[PDB]
Short mmCIF file of C-alpha atoms (C1' of nucleotides) and ligand atoms in Angstrom, two decimals:
data_model
loop_
_atom_site.label_atom_id
_atom_site.label_comp_id
_atom_site.label_asym_id
_atom_site.label_seq_id
_atom_site.Cartn_x
_atom_site.Cartn_y
_atom_site.Cartn_z
CA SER A 3 0.01 0.00 0.01
CA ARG A 4 1.19 3.62 -0.77
CA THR A 5 -1.75 4.45 1.46
CA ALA A 6 -1.21 4.23 5.11
CA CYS A 7 -3.15 6.55 7.38
CA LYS A 8 -1.73 9.62 9.14
CA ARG A 9 -1.86 7.59 12.34
CA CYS A 10 -0.20 4.45 11.33
CA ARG A 11 2.70 6.20 9.54
CA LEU A 12 3.37 8.10 12.75
CA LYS A 13 3.26 5.05 14.97
CA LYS A 14 4.95 3.35 12.14
CA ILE A 15 2.59 0.32 12.28
CA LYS A 16 0.88 -1.63 9.43
CA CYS A 17 -2.14 0.28 8.09
CA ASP A 18 -5.17 -1.90 7.39
CA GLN A 19 -6.41 -0.63 3.93
CA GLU A 20 -10.13 -0.73 4.34
CA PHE A 21 -12.88 1.86 4.16
CA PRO A 22 -14.18 3.81 5.91
CA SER A 23 -11.39 2.92 8.27
CA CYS A 24 -8.18 0.94 8.70
CA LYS A 25 -8.29 -1.64 11.38
CA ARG A 26 -6.34 -0.07 14.10
CA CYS A 27 -7.96 3.38 13.75
CA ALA A 28 -11.28 1.71 14.33
CA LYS A 29 -10.33 -0.27 17.38
CA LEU A 30 -8.13 2.42 18.74
CA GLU A 31 -11.53 4.28 17.91
CA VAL A 32 -10.16 7.18 15.97
CA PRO A 33 -10.77 9.09 12.69
CA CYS A 34 -8.86 7.48 9.75
CA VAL A 35 -7.37 10.13 7.66
CA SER A 36 -5.25 9.76 4.59
CA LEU A 37 -2.73 12.36 3.46
CA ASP A 38 -3.70 12.76 -0.27
CA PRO A 39 -0.52 12.23 -2.34
CA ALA A 40 -1.07 14.85 -5.05
CA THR A 41 -2.90 17.68 -3.30
CA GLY A 42 -1.02 16.82 -0.14
CA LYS A 43 -4.15 17.27 1.91
CA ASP A 44 -5.85 15.43 4.68
CA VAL A 45 -8.72 13.10 3.56
CA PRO A 46 -10.73 11.19 6.02
CA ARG A 47 -11.12 7.77 4.36
CA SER A 48 -14.76 7.74 5.25
CA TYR A 49 -15.34 11.04 3.48
CA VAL A 50 -14.30 9.10 0.48
CA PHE A 51 -16.50 6.30 1.71
CA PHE A 52 -19.56 8.29 1.47
CA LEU A 53 -18.55 10.24 -1.43
CA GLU A 54 -18.28 6.96 -3.09
CA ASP A 55 -21.68 6.04 -1.99
CA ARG A 56 -23.04 9.19 -3.52
CA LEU A 57 -21.86 8.19 -6.95
CA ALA A 58 -23.67 5.05 -6.23
CA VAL A 59 -26.96 6.59 -5.70
CA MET A 60 -26.31 8.92 -8.54
CA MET A 61 -25.62 6.07 -10.86
CA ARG A 62 -28.80 4.21 -9.98
CA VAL A 63 -30.77 7.37 -10.43
CA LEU A 64 -29.31 8.77 -13.63
CA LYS A 65 -29.38 5.29 -15.06
CA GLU A 66 -33.04 4.89 -14.20
CA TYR A 67 -33.79 8.16 -16.02
CA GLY A 68 -32.11 6.60 -18.94
CA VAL A 69 -28.31 7.53 -18.45
CA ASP A 70 -24.84 5.82 -17.38
CA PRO A 71 -21.04 7.12 -17.79
CA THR A 72 -20.30 10.98 -17.64
CA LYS A 73 -17.86 13.46 -19.20
CA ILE A 74 -15.76 15.06 -16.32
CA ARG A 75 -12.73 17.45 -15.69
CA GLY A 76 -10.02 15.84 -13.43
CA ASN A 77 -9.44 12.41 -15.05
CA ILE A 78 -8.53 8.67 -15.16
CA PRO A 79 -6.78 7.20 -18.20
CA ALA A 80 -3.91 8.61 -20.28
CA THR A 81 -6.68 8.62 -22.89
CA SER A 82 -9.19 11.14 -21.54
CA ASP A 83 -8.89 14.86 -22.40
CA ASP A 84 -7.06 17.18 -19.87
CA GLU A 85 -7.95 19.79 -17.23
CA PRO A 86 -8.18 23.73 -17.85
CA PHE A 87 -8.76 26.34 -14.86
CA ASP A 88 -12.39 27.51 -14.58
CA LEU A 89 -13.59 26.14 -18.01
CA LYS A 90 -14.15 22.36 -18.88
CA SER B 3 7.88 15.43 -5.39
CA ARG B 4 5.33 13.29 -3.39
CA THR B 5 3.90 11.67 -6.46
CA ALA B 6 4.99 12.01 -9.96
CA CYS B 7 2.62 11.20 -12.92
CA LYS B 8 2.28 8.48 -15.51
CA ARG B 9 4.07 10.40 -18.12
CA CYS B 10 6.95 11.66 -15.96
CA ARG B 11 7.46 8.44 -14.15
CA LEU B 12 7.82 6.61 -17.30
CA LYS B 13 9.77 9.37 -18.90
CA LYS B 14 11.98 9.14 -15.85
CA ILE B 15 12.13 12.87 -15.47
CA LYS B 16 11.37 15.41 -12.85
CA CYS B 17 7.62 16.00 -12.09
CA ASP B 18 6.56 19.39 -10.88
CA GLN B 19 3.63 18.00 -8.96
CA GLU B 20 0.78 20.37 -9.69
CA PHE B 21 -2.90 20.24 -9.31
CA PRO B 22 -4.64 19.09 -11.12
CA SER B 23 -2.15 18.12 -13.84
CA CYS B 24 1.50 19.11 -13.56
CA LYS B 25 2.84 21.82 -15.89
CA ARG B 26 4.88 19.51 -17.92
CA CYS B 27 1.78 17.65 -19.11
CA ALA B 28 -0.24 20.89 -19.07
CA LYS B 29 2.11 22.57 -21.43
CA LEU B 30 1.89 19.85 -23.85
CA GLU B 31 -1.83 19.23 -23.24
CA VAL B 32 -1.51 15.50 -22.68
CA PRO B 33 -4.06 14.58 -19.97
CA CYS B 34 -2.26 14.31 -16.78
CA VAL B 35 -2.98 11.23 -14.64
CA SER B 36 -1.47 9.20 -12.00
CA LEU B 37 -0.57 5.55 -12.16
CA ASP B 38 -1.58 2.60 -9.93
CA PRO B 39 1.59 0.74 -9.03
CA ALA B 40 -0.35 -2.38 -7.93
CA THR B 41 -2.77 -2.68 -10.96
CA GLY B 42 -0.69 -0.82 -13.52
CA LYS B 43 -3.95 0.95 -14.67
CA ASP B 44 -4.11 4.66 -15.41
CA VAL B 45 -5.68 6.58 -12.49
CA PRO B 46 -6.31 10.18 -11.50
CA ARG B 47 -3.86 12.30 -9.75
CA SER B 48 -6.61 12.67 -7.15
CA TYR B 49 -9.44 10.33 -6.12
CA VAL B 50 -11.44 12.75 -3.96
CA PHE B 51 -10.80 15.34 -6.37
CA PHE B 52 -12.21 13.01 -8.96
CA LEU B 53 -15.09 12.07 -7.00
CA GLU B 54 -16.08 15.53 -6.05
CA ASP B 55 -15.87 16.26 -9.69
CA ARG B 56 -17.74 13.36 -10.81
CA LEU B 57 -20.81 13.86 -8.60
CA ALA B 58 -20.96 17.46 -9.57
CA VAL B 59 -21.58 16.65 -13.19
CA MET B 60 -23.73 13.76 -12.18
CA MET B 61 -25.78 16.23 -10.18
CA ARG B 62 -26.12 18.81 -12.85
CA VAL B 63 -27.30 16.25 -15.20
CA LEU B 64 -29.73 14.94 -12.74
CA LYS B 65 -31.07 18.49 -12.19
CA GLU B 66 -31.85 18.88 -15.96
CA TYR B 67 -33.77 15.67 -15.60
CA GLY B 68 -35.74 17.06 -12.63
CA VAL B 69 -34.16 15.30 -9.58
CA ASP B 70 -31.76 15.99 -6.66
CA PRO B 71 -30.00 14.72 -3.49
CA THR B 72 -31.60 11.21 -3.88
"C1'" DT C 1 15.57 7.11 -23.10
"C1'" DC C 2 17.52 5.31 -19.02
"C1'" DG C 3 21.26 3.86 -15.75
"C1'" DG C 4 21.48 3.89 -11.62
"C1'" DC C 5 21.55 6.27 -6.88
"C1'" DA C 6 18.96 9.65 -3.65
"C1'" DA C 7 15.25 9.79 -0.92
"C1'" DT C 8 11.14 8.32 0.70
"C1'" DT C 9 8.45 5.19 2.59
"C1'" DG C 10 5.69 0.93 4.97
"C1'" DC C 11 6.25 -1.28 8.97
"C1'" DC C 12 9.23 -5.05 12.06
"C1'" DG C 13 10.82 -5.93 16.08
"C1'" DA C 14 12.07 -4.41 20.24
"C1'" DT D 1 6.91 4.18 20.35
"C1'" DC D 2 11.00 4.11 17.65
"C1'" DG D 3 15.81 2.39 15.35
"C1'" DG D 4 16.24 0.86 11.12
"C1'" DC D 5 16.89 -1.77 7.00
"C1'" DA D 6 13.80 -3.24 2.43
"C1'" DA D 7 11.28 -1.70 -0.87
"C1'" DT D 8 10.02 1.67 -3.45
"C1'" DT D 9 10.18 5.20 -5.85
"C1'" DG D 10 12.15 10.50 -7.55
"C1'" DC D 11 15.13 12.18 -10.80
"C1'" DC D 12 20.28 13.62 -12.15
"C1'" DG D 13 22.42 13.67 -15.85
"C1'" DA D 14 24.44 12.03 -19.97
ZN1 ZN E 1 -3.93 2.95 9.32
ZN1 ZN E 2 -6.34 4.65 10.11
ZN1 ZN E 3 4.34 15.13 -14.39
ZN1 ZN E 4 1.52 15.34 -15.47
#
DNA sequence: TCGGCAATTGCCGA
DNA sequence: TCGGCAATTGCCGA
């Protein structure tokens, strides 16, 4: 894993890669926060949890209405188009 | 320096690390993405940033179809 | 384009 | 909680 939670790294112990929390964090009871590589910022793993859920809903919904896969802005393969400040 | 992109890592050359797509790739206009060491698949310099982006557009579309926060 | 070494890391064991 | 070495990875430089 290149993901190991702000806790774990500190303690220097082996971060348990699950969402919305790595094993120790849980037990030890705490908030599981990942330091985002690029942006460098904190990211509670759960925040991603839910945010992931939200696509989920969104995908049922928008699919129901007769839709699927969307054009974006930040992006995934070396084959999408790139970002530009403000504009799409 | 915390994480250098697909293109630079393979080019083996210094990556200015900028959000959301480092200048080197910006300049040239080649999409700038990160790369999953485990899978080898292309993957965005920033997951939450990608998600937050994704839902937005999902939302806007949903709005033009009448809906919401479902 | 890349050899190859600096610097980071994950995380073991104490 | 750390020393601390293994893996990993940034990136000079030619
Ligand atoms: Zn952890
Ligand atoms: Zn954690
Ligand atoms: Zn780059
Ligand atoms: Zn780039």
